[PDB]
Amino acid sequence: KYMTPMQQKLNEVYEAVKNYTDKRGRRLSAIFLRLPSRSELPDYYLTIKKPMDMEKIRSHMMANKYQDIDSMVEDFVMMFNNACTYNEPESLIYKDALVLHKVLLETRRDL
Numbered sequence: 001k002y003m004t005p006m007q008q009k010l011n012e013v014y015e016a017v018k019n020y021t022d023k024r025g026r027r028l029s030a031i032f033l034r035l036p037s038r039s040e041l042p043d044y045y046l047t048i049k050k051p052m053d054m055e056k057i058r059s060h061m062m063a064n065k066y067q068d069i070d071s072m073v074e075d076f077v078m079m080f081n082n083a084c085t086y087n088e089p090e091s092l093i094y095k096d097a098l099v100l101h102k103v104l105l106e107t108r109r110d111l
């Protein structure tokens with residue numbers, strides 16, 4: 001089937017976050033795309049109440065479950081807040097979550 005205009009707007013925001021690269025050309029999204037399975041990483045799933053990754057967000061988007069951009073932002077904020085809970089502020093993952101959140105809000109503003 002085809003994508004609604006809203007779905008196309010969401011996908012542009014999604015792809016912006018996914019494709020963002022720092023000054024060295026590293027994609028900050030890499031660790032956020034796909035969490036390991038609960039058997040692979042039990043301590044994550046036993047610590048974080050609502051596990052979330054970019055692939056889960058992309059599925060919800062393609063299933064036409066987000067009503068507007070603020071709905072999808074809510075799930076990005078969950079993912080990023082989870083990364084801040086699970087990791088330390090000095091860590092690379094924690095820092096990248098903050099950059100990508102900024103990229104997300106700046107993309108929403110541009111659109």
Ligand SMILES: CN(C)/C=C/C(=O)c1ccccc1O
Nearest residue numbers: 031032052053079082083086
């Ligand atoms: C790789 N370990 C240290 C942490 C992973 C995450 O914190 C994570 C990955 C994907 C989505 C959310 C996360 O908190």
